[PDB]
Amino acid sequence: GSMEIRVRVEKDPELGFRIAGGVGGRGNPFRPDDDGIFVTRVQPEGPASKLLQPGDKIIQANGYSFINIEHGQAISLLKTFQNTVELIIVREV
């Protein structure tokens, strides 16, 4: 069922989503025993609104693996990219 999808979010001025999870993140509202990074909220009319959705699991960002990544490390990485953030996400279809 699940597929790895690639999307490009243009910071305008930010990505327009929140996340939960990661190593040390004490879980997420979707799959408690998955320690990965999950999108929790997408800003309507924001840069991610046609691309990402709550529940999506981010497993890569601009070539950097998000598998086994810590919670703050993922937040810092996403904050630090200055323009386009090409994401690979896992989504149930």
Partner: peptide, 7 residues
């Protein structure tokens, strides 16, 4: 669980 701010 811990949730980030808006990114």
């Amino acid at each position: 669980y811990y949730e980030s701010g808006w990114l």
